[PDB]
Amino acid sequence: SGFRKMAFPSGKVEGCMVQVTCGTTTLNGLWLDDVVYCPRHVICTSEDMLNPNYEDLLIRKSNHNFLVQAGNVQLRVIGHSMQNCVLKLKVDTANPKTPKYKFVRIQPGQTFSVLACYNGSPSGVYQCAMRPNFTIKGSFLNGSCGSVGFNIDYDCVSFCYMHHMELPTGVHAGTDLEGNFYGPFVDRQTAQAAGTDTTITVNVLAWLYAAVINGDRWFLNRFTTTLNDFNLVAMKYNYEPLTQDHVDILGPLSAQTGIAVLDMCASLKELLQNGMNGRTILGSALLEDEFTPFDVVRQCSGVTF
Amino acid sequence: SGFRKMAFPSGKVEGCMVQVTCGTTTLNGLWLDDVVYCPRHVICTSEDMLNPNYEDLLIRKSNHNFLVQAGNVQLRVIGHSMQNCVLKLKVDTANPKTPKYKFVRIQPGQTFSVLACYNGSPSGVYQCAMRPNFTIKGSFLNGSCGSVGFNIDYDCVSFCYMHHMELPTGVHAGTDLEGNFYGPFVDRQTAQAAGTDTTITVNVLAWLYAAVINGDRWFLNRFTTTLNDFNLVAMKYNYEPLTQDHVDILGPLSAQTGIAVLDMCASLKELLQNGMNGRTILGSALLEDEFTPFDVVRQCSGVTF
Ligand SMILES: *[C@@H](CC(=O)OCC)[C@H](C[C@@H]1CCNC1=O)NC(=O)[C@@H](CC(=O)[C@@H](NC(=O)c1cc(C)on1)C(C)C)Cc1ccc(F)cc1
Numbered sequence: 163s164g165f166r167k168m169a170f171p172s173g174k175v176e177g178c179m180v181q182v183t184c185g186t187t188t189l190n191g192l193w194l195d196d197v198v199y200c201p202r203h204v205i206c207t208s209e210d211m212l213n214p215n216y217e218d219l220l221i222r223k224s225n226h227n228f229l230v231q232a233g234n235v236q237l238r239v240i241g242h243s244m245q246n247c248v249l250k251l252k253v254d255t256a257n258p259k260t261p262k263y264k265f266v267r268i269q270p271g272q273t274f275s276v277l278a279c280y281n282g283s284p285s286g287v288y289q290c291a292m293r294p295n296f297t298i299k300g301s302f303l304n305g306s307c308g309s310v311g312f313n314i315d316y317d318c319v320s321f322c323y324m325h326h327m328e329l330p331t332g333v334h335a336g337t338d339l340e341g342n343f344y345g346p347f348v349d350r351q352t353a354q355a356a357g358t359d360t361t362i363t364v365n366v367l368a369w370l371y372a373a374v375i376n377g378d379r380w381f382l383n384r385f386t387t388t389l390n391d392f393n394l395v396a397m398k399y400n401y402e403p404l405t406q407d408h409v410d411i412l413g414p415l416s417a418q419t420g421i422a423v424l425d426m427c428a429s430l431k432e433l434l435q436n437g438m439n440g441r442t443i444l445g446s447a448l449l450e451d452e453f454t455p456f457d458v459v460r461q462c463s464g465v466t467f
Numbered sequence: 468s469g470f471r472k473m474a475f476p477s478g479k480v481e482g483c484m485v486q487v488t489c490g491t492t493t494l495n496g497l498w499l500d501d502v503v504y505c506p507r508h509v510i511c512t513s514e515d516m517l518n519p520n521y522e523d524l525l526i527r528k529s530n531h532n533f534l535v536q537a538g539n540v541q542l543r544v545i546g547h548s549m550q551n552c553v554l555k556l557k558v559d560t561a562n563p564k565t566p567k568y569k570f571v572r573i574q575p576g577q578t579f580s581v582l583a584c585y586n587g588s589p590s591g592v593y594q595c596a597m598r599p600n601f602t603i604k605g606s607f608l609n610g611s612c613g614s615v616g617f618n619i620d621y622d623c624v625s626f627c628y629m630h631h632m633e634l635p636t637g638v639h640a641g642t643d644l645e646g647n648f649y650g651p652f653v654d655r656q657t658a659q660a661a662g663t664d665t666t667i668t669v670n671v672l673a674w675l676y677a678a679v680i681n682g683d684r685w686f687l688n689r690f691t692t693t694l695n696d697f698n699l700v701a702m703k704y705n706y707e708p709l710t711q712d713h714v715d716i717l718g719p720l721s722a723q724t725g726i727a728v729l730d731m732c733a734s735l736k737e738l739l740q741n742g743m744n745g746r747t748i749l750g751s752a753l754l755e756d757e758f759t760p761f762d763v764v765r766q767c768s769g770v771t772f
């Protein structure tokens with residue numbers, strides 16, 4: 163029993179992290195087969211942060227202007243292309259540690275693991291969720307760009323995030339591995355507003371099911387409610403609306419417990435309206451929303467990789 | 468910016484995880500060089516399970532009764548012995564992925580990363596604290612025994628925990644890698660009482676300092692107090708006493724923020740007396756106590772390994 167914010171094993175991704183340096187700019191890169199992926203910002207010459215001419219700057223920089231270091235092994239760059247906001251460096255050696263991988267674009271509410279890296283070396287791993295406003299609440303410092311986020315689908319490392327920027331609110335923004343930002347952000351020091359953050363309702367319910375599986379049922383009542391009666395309440399507290407698609411995704415946890423989705427919504431409606439009575443749920447005094455229904459099932463089953 | 472429950476990179480440990488099988492009983496082992504370490508209770512049956520004479524059970528076992536498998540290759544046990552609650556199986560093959568390692572016994576309040584495994588394969592990684600009552604609040608299912616906990620101290624994987632049992636409260640107990648349990652627990656199904664748990668005061672203060680480093684200052688007050696006055700309040704709220712050694716340990720965070728330790732103690736004193744005002748600190752509505760001062764500096768300064 164027990165339920166923790168659990169990250170994926172980071173070994174497979176650790177073997178892909180390298181240090182990319184261009185001029186004075188140094189950051190992290192992802193080395194898969196003979197291609198190294200990093201944020202294109204590495205070629206900016208400081209002044210370019212505002213209005214970078216990436217077209218003239220890629221033309222400007224030679225292959226020799228890029229240093230790639232896999233630990234203490236220098237990788238020879240033989241090509242440099244740009245895909246949206248990601249710079250792609252072709253190197254003369256294929257990474258033997260390359261795992262079975264895919265590039266995936268995740269949706270808001272889905273979780274992933276982040277391997278925070280600096281100078282091509284790992285510092286730690288933690289779980290994140292793509293917020294409804296396409297930011298992430300991570301832990302990134304200067305030098306952290308190029309760090310990636312990922313899931314492990316069975317035996318395939320699904321890369322879904324590369325880190326680029328930090329907003330003034332202390333949250334973070336980045337791209338998929340094709341260079342396309344999540345949300346309406348651009349890798350430049352310009353004006354950019356993140357929408358209102360909302361609570362990921364489908365995830366809160368999954369977490370309440372996890373609580374029930376692990377023997378926390380004090381929030382359970384005998385009431386029930388309709389899908390639209392619950393959303394009337396949720397929308398007032400910046401909770402994203404619940405749909406039948408979310409109810410279906412919760413079926414597996416509904417089954418394991420015998421508690422219908424709409425009976426748990428009624429219990430959640432109560433917690434949304436009148437707080438938590440100074441009690442806790444799986445060690446928290448707030449409604450946790452960064453656990454997907456899948457995360458709960460795999461945690462309460464022991465799914466290995 | 469940002470502060471997350473951050474685990475160490477698990478790569479070095481993933482490469483040491485193997486599957487140990489004695490009869491029908493299968494669990495996880497740690498393969499360092501030419502020896503596999505695992506819980507001795509793999510030799511038991513459920514008949515012996517109760518108050519087993521382990522010395523009599525090992526005697527009855529041979530090397531051939533132990534099947535060890537690293538991924539898809541099988542290792543040959545060429546010797547078996549027992550040190551406290553840990554079973555050492557000398558194997559004919561030495562692990563090439565063995566990191567520079569050390570077996571360490573951690574103090575209460577210290578943290579470590581847990582690599583939850585099943586059938587010799589990792590499932591996830593998360594942070595744990597050795598509670599003052601020598602339990603840990605983990606996430607473990609059947610077949611998780613043998614999973615280990617660790618810190619990375621610069622260039623050395625310091626193994627500090629091997630998982631054994633779940634108590635009726637939902638908490639967990641285990642040993643160091645020398646086979647010696649943390650706390651008064653035994654690897655048997657016999658009466659075992661965990662003491663009344665307490666909050667790790669020094670860690671709460673470190674987490675409040677992390678909040679200040681990350682901009683959350685709403686809880687700071689202009690007051691300071693004595694170490695006895697603070698401890699008078701603390702004892703009432705089930706907080707372990709604060710010692711001068713903990714004050715010194717917090718020096719670097721006080722030194723970095725400009726807030727004296729006893730100044731922060733008065734801020735915590737008022738949070739305990741009057742509550743958190745329905746607010747959150749670093750995304751929690753509770754006072755978090757599973758971040759050591761080092762953990763705070765680790766994540767706030769970008770340590771790598
Ligand atoms: C990553 C930069 C890096 O690793 O390169 C080292 C040479 C860095 C991440 C942030 C640093 C502080 N905490 C972070 O998460 N990104 C940057 O430095 C970019 C600039 C910023 O992100 C600033 N924030 C904004 O510009 C901003 C403002 C708004 C409204 O939205 N975004 C932070 C410094 C505060 C520039 C950069 C440099 C190199 C890259 F590879 C990508 C992006």
Ligand SMILES: *[C@@H](CC(=O)OCC)[C@H](C[C@@H]1CCNC1=O)NC(=O)[C@@H](CC(=O)[C@@H](NC(=O)c1cc(C)on1)C(C)C)Cc1ccc(F)cc1
Nearest residue numbers: 493494506508607608609610611612631632633634656659
């Ligand atoms: C691990 C056993 C395993 O890996 O499978 C081998 C076939 C398992 C993990 C615990 C159960 C689930 N969560 C856990 O942490 N441990 C056990 O099965 C041990 C039995 C128990 O822990 C029981 N609890 C007690 O006996 C107990 C009683 C008191 C007063 O305090 N604790 C729970 C299952 C109810 C037995 C075991 C088996 C094999 C080992 F290598 C070590 C320990």
